[PDB]
């Protein structure tokens, strides 16, 4: 089971819905839910940080990013949270298909073409990647469309693989759930 931290955004139901579609159980929890509570449930094999309108209403997500022992996928505000939590740079709203380019055969993008259209808003973005992170994807308007901690199962995407307008969105979720011990025949 995957725990989804409700950072207050519009597509949280969509994360739950899309995980169910590919065979993955998930529970939406208030974003104040303590890390200990999340990892004490032996059924939990990973954590998704959702999108949300305000970085300051999601500061619990910092302790989780720093200290969780489980895999983490941060989505939009979730990705920006992972970045600030590890000393990187976030900074400054409508939703559109963005052409994203994959950088160099990361697992996050197994079975995804080198280019694909991603449902994204760039209200904000990671301006500078934390030390010890690598960039996994970019576009013409955003240098950091996806990233990963080089030594930890911690993944960041600026876009919404949960929304069906994202090409291979369900393949990106499969690739992340693969890290949480799931197999997709």
């Amino acid at each position: 089971m995957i725990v989804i931290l409700d950072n207050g955004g519009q597509y949280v139901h969509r994360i739950h819905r899309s995980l169910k579609y590919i065979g993955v159980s998930s529970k939406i929890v208030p974003n104040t839910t303590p890390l200990e509570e999340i990892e004490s449930n032996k059924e939990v094999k990973g954590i998704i940080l959702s999108g949300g309108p305000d970085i300051e209403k999601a500061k619990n997500c910092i302790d989780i990013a720093l200290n969780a022992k489980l895999p983490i996928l941060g989505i939009c505000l979730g990705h920006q949270l992972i970045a600030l939590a590890y000393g990187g740079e976030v900074g400054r709203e409508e939703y559109a298909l963005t052409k994203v380019y994959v950088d160099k055969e990361p697992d996050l993008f197994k079975n995804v073409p080198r280019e694909f259209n991603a449902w994204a808003s760039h209200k904000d973005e990671v301006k500078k990647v934390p030390e010890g992170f690598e960039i996994l994807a970019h576009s013409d308007i955003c240098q950091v469309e996806a990233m990963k901690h080089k030594t930890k199962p911690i993944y960041g995407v600026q876009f919404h693989p949960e929304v069906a307008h994202t090409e291979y969105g369900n393949e990106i979720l499969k690739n992340f759930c693969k890290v949480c011990g799931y197999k997709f025949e």
Side-chain angles (χ1 to χ4, degrees), residues 16-56 58 60-68 70-88 90-92 94-103 106-109 111-127 129-182:
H16 184 262
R17 263 198 1 128
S18 294
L19 282 181
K20 187 157 202 275
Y21 186 69
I22 66 168
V24 169
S25 187
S26 68
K27 180 206 182 180
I28 305 163
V29 298
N31 74 168
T32 47
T33 298
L35 169 61
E36 170 152 16
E37 169 167 347
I38 296 163
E39 293 184 323
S40 67
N41 183 351
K42 289 173 182 317
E43 283 318 282
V44 176
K45 298 308 199 117
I47 311 185
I48 296 167
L49 309 180
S50 93
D54 189 347
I55 192 114
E56 306 302 345
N60 187 33
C61 291
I62 286 161
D63 174 61
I64 293 167
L66 288 178
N67 301 313
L70 302 163
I72 289 171
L73 173 66
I75 295 185
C76 192
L77 191 94
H79 164 59
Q80 289 146 29
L81 279 159
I82 298 164
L84 257 161
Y86 280 92
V90 184
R92 259 298 219 84
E94 68 208 66
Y95 288 86
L97 288 185
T98 281
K99 198 125 227 45
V100 179
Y101 304 97
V102 171
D103 295 292
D107 280 337
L108 219 218
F109 291 108
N111 298 131
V112 182
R114 301 293 54 65
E115 320 170 354
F116 69 104
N117 291 307
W119 199 243
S121 146
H122 295 89
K123 176 189 204 279
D124 305 287
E125 59 169 342
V126 185
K127 299 278 188 191
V129 186
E131 185 71 2
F133 277 64
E134 56 203 350
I135 298 174
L136 299 181
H138 71 276
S139 58
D140 301 342
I141 195 133
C142 181
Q143 270 194 103
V144 192
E145 289 292 351
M147 71 188 177
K148 167 182 194 312
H149 195 311
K150 278 180 207 178
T151 46
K152 304 183 74 167
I154 303 183
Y155 298 83
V157 295
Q158 169 72 22
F159 58 82
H160 290 280
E162 75 272 29
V163 307
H165 302 329
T166 301
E167 289 190 293
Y168 315 99
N170 285 358
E171 204 71 59
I172 289 166
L173 289 182
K174 286 176 187 203
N175 289 327
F176 170 72
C177 290
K178 283 170 189 216
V179 183
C180 307
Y182 286 99

